[PDB]
């Protein structure tokens, strides 16, 4: 099982299919009832979806080395209060900041990191940035008003690829076959050992240690 992001709006064509909108996050189930379809669930509804309408899920809120200016840019456009992201300073490497939208402005918090490697905003110290974010999904980040962090509306990205290091003939069913050198579209890398991908018109599981990254360029 896996989550993916919708690249297009899909209106269901029969009653056993699942409608969705671009950018929705879909829970896809391991199986594929058709060669071109998955069964999937979304917002309390279940049905089939087409393989070629979904993309690997982007990270929901870690946004790398983007500047404070650009973060205000993308958070201004979000419809919902609490929309947030975390960014590294390209100035001070390794230091992080938290940008959140509330009303017609954008607040910036500095994430602190103590002698033990613990992160914090105020007093409570967290083992990781994930623990900070999830804490503040239900306790406000602001000391004046209730700001609860909410994932921004997500947009599907350009696809991520790997490249085969070795030939891989599939033994088991539902495994993806390829040849050394082949470029593989990656659909799910959430698991440390077995990833879901596509090549030569097929989809399936393959072992990550048979492939090497293809670094982004567009």
């Amino acid at each position: 099982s896996m989550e993916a992001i919708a690249k297009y709006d899909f209106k269901a064509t029969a009653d056993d299919e699942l409608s969705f909108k671009r950018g929705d996050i879909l829970k896809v189930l391991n199986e594929e009832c058709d060669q071109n379809w998955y069964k999937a669930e979304l917002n309390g509804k279940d049905g089939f979806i087409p393989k070629n309408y979904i993309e690997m899920k982007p990270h929901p809120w870690f946004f790398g080395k983007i500047p404070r200016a650009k973060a205000e840019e993308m958070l201004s456009k979000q419809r919902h209060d609490g929309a947030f992201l975390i960014r590294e300073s390209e100035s001070a490497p390794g230091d992080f900041s938290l940008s959140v939208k509330f009303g017609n402005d954008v607040q910036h918090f500095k994430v602190l990191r103590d002698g033990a490697g613990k992160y914090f905003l105020w007093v409570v110290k967290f083992n990781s940035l994930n623990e900070l974010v999830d804490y503040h999904r239900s306790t406000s980040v602001s000391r004046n008003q209730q700001i609860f962090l909410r994932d921004i509306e997500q947009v599907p990205q350009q696809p991520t690829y790997v490249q085969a290091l070795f030939d891989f003939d599939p033994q088991e069913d539902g495994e993806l076959g390829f040849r050394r050198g082949d470029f593989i579209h990656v659909m799910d890398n959430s698991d440390p050992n077995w990833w879901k991908g596509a090549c030569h018109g097929q989809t399936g599981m393959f072992p990550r240690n048979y492939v090497t990254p293809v670094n982004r360029n567009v």
């Binding site: 900041s97 607040q107 910036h108 918090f109 500095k110 905003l121 105020w122 602001s142």
Partner: peptide, 5 residues
């Protein structure tokens, strides 16, 4: 800026 100086 920062909301926790």
């Amino acid at each position: 800026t920062y909301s926790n100086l």
